[PDB]
Design a protein around this ligand. Structure first.
Ligand SMILES: CCCCCCCCCCCCCCCCCC(=O)OC[C@H](COP(=O)([O-])OCC(O)COP(=O)([O-])OC[C@@H](COC(=O)CCCCCCCCCCCCCCCCC)OC(=O)CCCCCCCCCCCCCCCCC)OC(=O)CCCCCCCCCCCCCCCCC
Ligand SMILES: CCCCCCCCCCCCCCCCCC(=O)OC[C@H](COP(=O)([O-])OCC(O)COP(=O)([O-])OC[C@@H](COC(=O)CCCCCCCCCCCCCCCCC)OC(=O)CCCCCCCCCCCCCCCCC)OC(=O)CCCCCCCCCCCCCCCCC
Ligand SMILES: CCCCCCCCCCCCCCCCCC(=O)OC[C@H](COP(=O)([O-])OCC(O)COP(=O)([O-])OC[C@@H](COC(=O)CCCCCCCCCCCCCCCCC)OC(=O)CCCCCCCCCCCCCCCCC)OC(=O)CCCCCCCCCCCCCCCCC
Ligand SMILES: CCCCCCCCCCCCCCCCCC(=O)O[C@@H](COC(=O)CCCCCCCCCCCCCCC)COP(=O)(O)OCC[N+](C)(C)C
Ligand SMILES: CCCCCCCCCCCCCCCCCC(=O)O[C@@H](COC(=O)CCCCCCCCCCCCCCC)COP(=O)(O)OCC[N+](C)(C)C
Ligand SMILES: CCCCCCCCCCCCCCCCCC(=O)O[C@@H](COC(=O)CCCCCCCCCCCCCCC)COP(=O)(O)OC[C@H](O)CO
Ligand SMILES: CCCCCCCCCCCCCCCCCCCC(=O)O[C@H](COC(=O)CCCCCCCCCCCCCC)COP(=O)(O)OCCN
Ligand SMILES: CCCCCCCCCCCCCCCCCCCC(=O)O[C@H](COC(=O)CCCCCCCCCCCCCC)COP(=O)(O)OCCN
Ligand SMILES: CCCCCCCCCCCCCCCCCC(=O)OC[C@H](COP(=O)(O)O)OC(=O)CCCCCCCCCCCCCCCCC
Lengths: 387, 443, 108, 83, 157, 218
């Protein structure tokens, strides 16, 4: 009986109808597609199950779709969402491989498609490098899956070959020293895909890790590499895109410290606060709120980034992971300097914000002003909330 | 609590006043700091001195942030509520008014908190405000702002895991149950020493103060000297001594030698200074070293004498910063070589300078004299030589104090004219407080 | 010979006036270049530190020497206080397990 | 008062120009070699997590002391015509 | 004070001959105290000639690669190669110029126009492709009629 | 609680040592076994065998730094030099091999000096690490201008001191640390006793130093 699979049939039927509707709308010469975007958001809601993580991903992708305008980009983001959703439910390396590869192909094509102006060739260059680096990591995953399949005779993810699969997962999160594909991507690709790349796949992969993964090894050297390299790199790079790429490497090192000491509640709290800050960061038009992102990414006390860092520090001290904790505290002391550089650049400066001329007047002030109210979330964060 | 919410909401309404009404903006921001002075005076009226040690308690559920009043917190809160309207008289922009209003909220709530995580959250939420206040673009110094922020962050980051260690150990950060549980006192003691030895300027983590307290504006210098250093002392008296007392006994030779070398070396450095504001800025380190050793003696009435020295310093050194600020505001320099004969040209300002010079050197009829006598009683009762070190080095403090006064006040008359009504009334509450607390402090 | 007030009060700025107005900067000092240079140099004197012979010798005998003297005096005072109070030898930091914190229920 | 810039302008500007008269390589080689090094040889550190902490700390300090910085890196071999 | 001359703009005028990358000579007028990159921008040169000063807190300054004759080598302002400004110039030479570098290569924001520059002839040097962000890049070919002067803002973000 | 007269917790102490606190209904640890190479590497009774067991790991750091420097040198090679493959191989292998041998030498010197002072003094404390750090840093700092022959022994001794304090002394001091169940020496407060220590699937760098801290595995 197939009566337990109506959501899958609904997914496929919705894709079949959406392609035909997008074709009919384009035969009329419509230069805007807000109706297509609303149908895409409805389809996103209709295929998502009733778990916390699934709906967090769903609501995140509904918010992200407001920064994309063409039909093909919307289709690629939907088919990347299918991989992102179904990776959280993957209990093998077969589905794991297919979901990861679908996401990689969608990201590569979007990086090629959306570039404009003088930065087109730089974006295509960085997309090619990302594709080549992704191909060999995919080959490593397939090779060691074949080794595990031959040794165990089954699809269980146990044994020594899980160390290389773990390295595949660490590549997909931009963990140093395999971090330079993300550093290349941050310097050229436009802001909407940078917003997409810093939020949704990290959530999808960490939920797969929380749900169906065990390894008998450690990730401590990659924690050290990510934290020290990210902090020193963001201290040393004057371009703002490289600053935010290296600060992202530092944040993924903190999330790996939360993974390594168990306690995924602190991981989920810090990831949620980080995702809301990212949603504020890449949609800013008034540059004074760039200082709020700075004080809430430096871990300064009353804002929500402090709470996200401080439960990670608390659980690390609870299980006595002293050396990694000391390295994390040193890199936190270093991170403050370049977040202060951000504050010097964009707060202690005269205010200029250009008006719109061709309509759409400051079109994402709702989301940015809503996400700035991360100064009111700390009242709920101090309680036993995320567990 | 309801009153505190009303005072915060009244204070925050300065932003909504349109800027073209200048008189209204000035009056509103001045009254917004006058009202908490009245409320804290009323809290002193309400206090029962024969009752419990902790009075007027309030706890906000499972959010930490629990509050209560003892004598040290009450005296420090009274001093802060005196000092903030004087700061309001020395500012001219809405940005300055709002920075000092937010600083007053954070200081007042930090002085009376009873939760260690609440103390951590409330105190160093002022870090970015201090960075913007010190590194202001045309006339500040970004180097000084970077130094003060980075030293404070370093100490706080050492404390934070030990805070969370005792929280996992017993289940709470409330100081009433942290003092009654069994905890690993060496680790938490080192974390608390790390924060409070940076807040109180103790060598070697003291180099931020000479840059920050000079690069700050006059209002910022009044706040930083008179208030923010004493948060380390109230940290010692409220959190570290009750919760980790075994550590506080075992670290006594190390804290003792840190206090002795801080006192001697900072007094020796003050003699070679050539900037008037740097002269006033160094002298605060030796006083805080005497405060720290009197706190750590724990001997006769150590909390009383050390709190009284904190109040006497918080009255006398902001007035010296105010006089240096007047000279800088109306002569555009802080350099000793440009000033001479200020007695003939500013007789009232020089008289105030002399009286506060005598107060800073702990002469009688000033609260510093009573303070230093009682602090040395507390130090003497552990050993006589630890008192002798401070006693014999009194010539070294008087040397720099009288040398600075004699160089700038006597000689050929050159320099600005005497004080205005506004400058005199910025100075005046500190003088009245000094005369009272140095003649009839108690009844 | 400026006129910055009307006969009934009312301060006037005198922006376009010929006569120089008396104001906040009227008594600002005329800067001597060599004094400004000397104060600038003393403000940045950490660039002049060098590990030569005299610096090393004076940093050893005075800074480290008096720090060690103060540590020795502090330990001496602590031990003498514990002896004159009827206590045994007490555990300072790095001193093996011993007595810390006398009991108030005990007569020493 | 403003401090004087130390040195000579011609000599300083020749120092600023030095070792940069060369086309910069693409970053694909560095990234591919980093990924090959991690995917082939990072399993050599699996037993290192159980080694004594004095050894681990001295090894970390040794790696820091022998590290060569990628930014502003230059070799004399870039401008010679024979080994 | 007496019958001395009224101040004119002609007293503060500096004339520089600029040879662009096509070999066409141009007459460029500036004022004393203005940098060379500003006079080049206000003359009307295309936006492909200019690039950000790659220091911290100065990417809002536009800069150009100029060739300066040996007589005017000593009138370029001095930069300490150990300071942070020196590392900014080193980053610009490392990334923007590369193998177009000559012994006459300087950067135009480090030239402050005075009376000593009057009659100096400079040439615009070629640069490699570069990117700061998606709204400010250079693909490598000087085929664009858009002036740098017509941009309302210089955006670091 | 808070008075200006005295500090009551400074004189309110236990009169007797306490008994051990029961934290769970099961009081046996669960953990994965240590590999035998690290078990052998902990033994200090044979100074030579200690240095032989420990030095290859410290040589791995020099191998990593040398491989980095070798690739960065290879990328800058002009084609007239890069096509000569024997010369290229001997240059790059020279860079890598010099770095690897120097790291292995520093590691062997440190481990041998540490175990020698350990066996000479008859006890395990922090002095052996400080002396070994001073010797190794003086070996590194030789031949250099003079802040450095003092600065490098200080840095290597400081690394040894940080190693002792963070990795050895603090875990030993907090062996009785509990995050769950009854508060230690405060069992009268009534916090309930769980059936077991908490099961945590931590990484290999976070392992329980006491059997009662947590159960590690899956
Ligand atoms: C085989 C095939 C061969 C392939 C080879 C690939 C190489 C490709 C090149 C490359 O990677 O580019 C470099 C690349 C540069 O990174 P980037 O992404 O471009 O930039 C990031 C940063 O900005 C870095 O910026 P930068 O490089 O331009 O330099 C800026 C500089 C700027 O530095 C600063 O300004 C900061 C310095 C702070 C203090 C300064 C000193 C002041 C002290 C005062 C003086 C008193 C005296 C004291 C003496 C010293 C005491 C401290 O930063 C540093 O130097 C610090 C970076 C060091 C990272 C350390 C993290 C490692 C783990 C953490 C533990 C150890 C850390 C030390 C702490 C412990 C000490 C107890 O580096 C990496 O990506 C790292 C990986 C490379 C290393 C290993 C290579 C793998 C090959 C393996 C070999 C074979 C297998 C054997 C090992 C087993 C598997 C691991
Ligand atoms: C069965 C499922 C039915 C559909 C559910 C998913 C589709 C949601 C898409 C949506 O709300 O379209 C926005 C659309 C407004 O777009 P628009 O006015 O054409 O565009 C104007 C500009 O965007 C400029 O206007 P704006 O940026 O100020 O407003 C954008 C828009 C939404 O703007 C945002 O994306 C920011 C709002 C942040 C709140 C996020 C909530 C998540 C909280 C998590 C709690 C758990 O504004 C709203 O907040 C409209 C909410 C209406 C009810 C939503 C349910 O709302 C509607 O027309 C109503 C949609 C509700 C169902 C029909
Ligand atoms: C800490 C920060 C740096 C320390 C300051 C040292 C410095 O930079 O002095 C430069 C400065 C160089 O002066 P210069 O203007 O270039 O000309 C003087 C010489 O002609 C130029 O000679 P040179 O120093 O360039 O090299 C030749 C040197 C030969 O010296 C060396 O090759 C190195 C010096 C000692 C070896 C280091 C081994 C271990 C020391 C580190 C301790 C780590 C603790 C581990 C636990 O021969 C001498 O100068 C004869 C005097 C050497 C006496 C060595 C006695 C040390 C053992 C202590 C016994 C108690 O050194 C001096 O003032 C001369 C004394 C030589 C070094 C200082 C020795 C005692 C001070 C050590 C204090 C550190 C302990 C901290 C606890
Ligand atoms: C640790 C004890 C606190 C002592 C701190 C030193 C205070 C500095 C000045 C000394 C004044 C002594 C006042 C004694 C009588 C006042 C009431 C009183 O008893 O004090 C209160 C608290 O006293 C205060 O708050 C004094 C306020 C002093 C602050 C003055 C400085 C601010 C004024 C600035 C200048 C204003 C001028 C304005 C005019 C133009 C409680 O202290 P204890 O008696 O120790 O508490 C008893 C303990 N137990 C409940 C457990 C039994
Ligand atoms: C403004 C809108 C955005 C504000 C976001 C702030 C996020 C955190 C940034 C760093 C902390 C800075 C806090 C300073 C507060 C005091 C201050 O100076 O307030 C400001 C305004 O600050 C506020 O937004 C006050 C309201 C927020 C706090 C009070 C309500 C919530 C509690 C006064 O106006 P000006 O400084 O003249 O504004 C000009 C802006 N600019 C510097 C860019 C030239
Ligand atoms: C996030 C919000 C901002 C930061 C947190 C601020 C927390 C509030 C401030 C501290 C609250 C306790 C005040 C001290 C005190 O003793 O209060 C008692 C006495 O009340 C007062 O008189 C309070 C006086 C408030 C002002 C005095 C200074 C304290 C802090 C100042 C904050 C505002 C300053 C404005 C400056 C512009 C409590 O009265 P109650 O009736 O609520 O409690 C009795 C019983 O337990 C029932 O719960
Ligand atoms: C107002 C915001 C601005 C508007 C814009 C909206 C932005 C899009 C939507 C938010 C995107 C960020 C969300 C990130 C994911 C966080 C939630 C992951 C789930 C999680 O934490 O775990 C569950 C706790 O849920 C919880 O209750 C977690 C609490 C919330 C965490 C986020 C904290 C920051 C806010 C426990 O799951 P379980 O125990 O039920 O699972 C067992 C069955 N498998
Ligand atoms: C918190 C912020 C402030 C921190 C200041 C730096 C603290 C450095 C020392 C930390 C504790 C070290 C360990 C103490 C116990 C220990 O093992 O060493 C004892 C001596 O150490 C000692 O206690 C002697 C060294 C400490 C002297 C005072 C601190 C020096 C640093 C600041 C000086 C500033 C001066 C400015 C020019 C042993 O005793 P032993 O073996 O020697 O006894 C002979 C009989 N066994
Ligand atoms: C501030 C300066 C204030 C001092 C001014 C002048 C005072 C002159 C005092 C001269 C004598 C002092 C007392 C010594 C004789 C009494 C003796 O009591 O017993 C000692 C004392 C008492 O022994 P006990 O009473 O038997 O336990 O011995 C010790 O336990 C301490 C022994 C080691 C002392 C030096 C440790 C090394 C510290 C290095 C500090 C340098 C850091 C540099 C950083 C920069």
């Amino acid at each position: 009986a197939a009566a337990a699979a109506m959501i899958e049939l609904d997914l496929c039927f919705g894709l079949l109808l959406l392609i035909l509707f997008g074709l009919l709308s384009l035969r009329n010469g419509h230069v805007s597609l807000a109706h297509i975007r609303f149908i895409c958001q409805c389809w996103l809601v209709m295929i998502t199950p009733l778990e916390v993580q699934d709906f967090a991903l769903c609501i995140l992708t509904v918010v992200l779709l407001q920064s994309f305008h063409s039909f093909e980009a919307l289709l690629f983001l939907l088919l990347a969402y299918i991989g992102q959703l179904y990776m959280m439910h993957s209990c093998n390396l077969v589905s794991f491989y297919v979901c990861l590869e679908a996401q990689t192909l969608c990201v590569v094509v979007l990086c090629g498609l959306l570039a404009r102006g003088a930065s087109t060739s730089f974006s295509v260059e960085a997309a090619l490098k990302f594709l080549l680096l992704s191909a060999m990591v995919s080959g490593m995953a397939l090779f060691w899956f074949s080794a595990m399949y031959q040794r165990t005779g089954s699809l269980d993810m146990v044994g020594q070959e899980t160390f290389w699969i773990l390295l595949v997962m660490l590549f997909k999160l931009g963990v140093a020293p395999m971090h330079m594909w993300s550093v290349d991507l941050y310097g050229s690709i436009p802001k909407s895909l940078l917003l997409y790349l810093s939020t949704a796949p990290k959530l999808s992969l960490f939920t797969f890790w929380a749900s169906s993964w065990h390894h008998d090894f450690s990730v401590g050297v990659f924690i050290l590499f990510s934290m020290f390299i990210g902090s020193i790199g963001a201290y040393g790079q004057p371009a703002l895109r490289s600053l935010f790429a290296y600060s992202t490497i530092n944040e993924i090192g903190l999330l790996l410290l939360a993974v390594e000491t168990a306690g995924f509640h602190t991981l989920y709290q810090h990831l949620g606060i980080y995702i809301i800050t990212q949603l504020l960061l890449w949609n800013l038009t008034d540059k004074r709120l760039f200082a709020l992102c700075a004080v809430s990414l430096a871990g300064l006390p009353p804002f929500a980034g402090f709470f996200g860092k401080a439960w990670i520090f608390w659980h690390a001290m609870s299980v006595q992971a002293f050396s990694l904790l000391a390295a994390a505290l040193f890199c936190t002391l270093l991170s403050l300097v370049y977040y202060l550089r951000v504050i010097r650049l964009f707060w202690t400066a005269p205010v200029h914000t250009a008006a719109s001329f061709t309509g759409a007047p400051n079109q994402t002030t709702l989301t940015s002003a809503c996400a700035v109210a991360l100064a009111f979330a700390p009242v709920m964060l101090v309680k036993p909330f995320v567990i | 609590m309801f009153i505190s919410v009303l005072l915060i909401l009244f204070a925050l309404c300065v932003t909504l006043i349109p800027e073209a009404h200048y008189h209204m903006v000035r009056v509103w921001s001045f009254v917004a700091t006058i009202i908490p002075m009245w409320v804290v005076t009323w809290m002193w009226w309400n206090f029962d001195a024969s009752g419990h040690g902790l009075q007027m308690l309030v706890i906000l559920g499972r959010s930490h942030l629990a509050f209560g009043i003892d004598g040290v917190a009450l005296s420090l809160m009274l001093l802060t509520t005196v000092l903030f309207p004087i700061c309001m008289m020395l500012l001219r922009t809405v940005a300055g008014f709002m920075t000092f209003i937010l600083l007053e909220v954070l200081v007042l709530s930090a002085l009376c908190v009873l939760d260690l995580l609440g103390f951590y959250i409330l105190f160093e939420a002022s870090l970015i405000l201090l960075f913007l206040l010190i590194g202001r673009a045309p006339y500040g110094s970004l180097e000084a702002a970077y130094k003060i922020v980075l030293y404070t962050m370093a100490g706080s980051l050492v404390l934070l895991p030990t805070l969370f260690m005792i929280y996992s150990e017993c289940g709470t950060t409330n100081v009433l149950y942290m003092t009654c549980a069994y905890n690993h006192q060496t680790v938490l003691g080192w974390g608390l020493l790390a924060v409070l030895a940076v807040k109180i300027p103790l060598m070697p983590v003291h180099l931020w103060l000479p840059e920050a307290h000079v690069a700050a504006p006059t209002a910022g210098s009044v706040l930083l000297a008179g208030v923010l250093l004493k948060l380390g002392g109230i940290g010692f008296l409220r959190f570290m001594l009750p919760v980790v007392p075994e550590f506080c006994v075992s670290v006594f030779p190390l804290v003792s030698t840190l206090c002795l070398v801080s006192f001697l070396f900072s007094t020796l450095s003050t003699l070679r200074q050539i900037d008037l504001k740097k002269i006033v800025a160094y002298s605060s380190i030796a006083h805080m070293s005497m405060v720290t050793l009197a706190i750590f003696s724990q001997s006769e009435f150590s909390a009383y004498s050390s709190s009284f020295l904190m109040i006497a310093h918080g009255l006398i050194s902001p007035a010296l910063f105010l006089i240096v600020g007047i000279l800088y505001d109306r002569a555009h320099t802080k350099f000793i070589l440009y000033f001479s004969g200020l007695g003939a040209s500013m007789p009232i300002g020089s008289t105030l300078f002399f009286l506060f010079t005598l107060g800073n050197l702990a002469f009688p009829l000033f609260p510093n004299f009573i303070a230093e006598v009682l602090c040395m009683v507390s130090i003497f009762a552990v050993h006589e030589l630890l008192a002798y070190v401070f006693c014999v080095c009194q010539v070294l403090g008087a040397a720099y104090g009288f040398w600075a006064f004699n160089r700038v006040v006597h000689g050929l008359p050159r320099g600005p004219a005497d004080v205005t009504r506004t400058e005199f009334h910025t100075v005046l509450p500190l003088l009245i407080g000094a005369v009272w607390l140095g003649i009839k402090p108690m009844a | 010979e400026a006129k910055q007030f009307t006969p009934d009060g009312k301060y006037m700025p005198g922006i376009f006036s010929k006569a120089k107005p008396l104001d906040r900067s009227t008594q600002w000092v005329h800067k001597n270049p060599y004094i400004e240079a000397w104060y600038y140099r003393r403000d940045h004197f950490e660039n002049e530190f060098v590990w030569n012979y005299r610096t090393t010798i004076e940093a050893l005998w005075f800074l480290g020497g008096f720090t060690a003297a103060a540590y020795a005096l502090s330990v001496f005072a602590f031990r003498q206080a514990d002896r004159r109070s009827g206590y045994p030898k007490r555990q300072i930091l790095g001193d093996e397990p011993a007595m810390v914190l006398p009991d108030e229920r005990q007569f020493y | 008062y403003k401090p004087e810039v130390p040195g000579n302008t011609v000599d300083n500007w020749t120092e600023l120009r030095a070792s940069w008269n060369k086309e910069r390589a693409s970053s694909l080689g560095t990234n591919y070699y980093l990924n090959v090094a991690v995917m082939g040889f990072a399993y050599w550190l699996n037993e290192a997590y159980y080694f004594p902490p004095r050894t681990l700390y001295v090894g970390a300090l040794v790696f820091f002391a022998l590290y060569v910085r990628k930014a502003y890196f230059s070799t004399p071999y870039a401008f010679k015509h024979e080994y | 004070h007496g019958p001395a001359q009224t101040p004119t703009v002609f007293d503060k005028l500096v004339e520089v001959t600029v040879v662009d990358m096509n070999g066409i000579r141009h007459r460029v007028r500036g004022l004393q105290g203005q940098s060379l990159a500003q006079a080049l921008v206000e003359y009307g040169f295309p936006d492909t000639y200019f690039f950000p000063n790659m220091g911290f807190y100065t990417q809002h300054i536009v800069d150009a690669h100029v060739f300066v004759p040996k007589e005017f080598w000593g009138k370029v302002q001095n930069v300490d190669p150990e300071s942070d400004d020196g590392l900014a110039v080193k980053r610009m030479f490392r990334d923007i110029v590369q193998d177009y570098q000559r012994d006459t290569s300087f950067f135009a924001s480090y030239i402050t126009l005075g009376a000593e520059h009057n009659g100096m002839t400079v040439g615009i040097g070629p640069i490699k492709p570069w990117i700061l962000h998606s709204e400010w890049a250079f693909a490598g070919v000087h085929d664009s009629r858009n002036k740098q002067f017509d941009k309302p803002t210089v955006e670091i973000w | 609680v808070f008075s200006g007269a005295f500090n009551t917790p400074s004189s309110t102490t236990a009169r007797e040592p306490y008994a051990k606190t029961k934290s769970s209904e099961a009081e046996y640890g669960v953990d994965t076994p240590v590999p035998a190479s690290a078990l052998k590497a902990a033994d200090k009774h044979d100074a030579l065998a200690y240095a032989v067991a420990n030095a290859p790991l410290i040589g791995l750091a020099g191998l990593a730094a040398g491989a980095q420097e070798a690739y960065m040198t290879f990328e800058r090679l002009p084609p007239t030099l890069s096509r000569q493959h024997f010369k290229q191989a001997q240059l790059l292998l020279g860079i890598i091999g010099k770095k690897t041998a120097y790291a292995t030498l520093l590691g062997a010197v440190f481990s041998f000096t540490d175990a020698t002072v350990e066996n000479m003094r008859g006890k395990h404390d922090m002095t052996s690490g400080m002396v070994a750090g001073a010797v190794t840093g003086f070996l590194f700092g030789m031949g250099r201008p003079m802040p450095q022959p003092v600065a490098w022994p200080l840095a290597f001794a400081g690394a040894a001191v940080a190693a002792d304090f963070i990795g050895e002394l603090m875990p030993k001091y907090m062996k009785d640390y509990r995050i769950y169940g009854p508060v230690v020496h405060r069992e009268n407060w009534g916090d309930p006793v769980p059936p077991r220590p908490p099961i945590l699937d931590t990484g290999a760098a976070v392992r329980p130093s006491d059997p009662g801290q947590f159960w590690r595995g899956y």
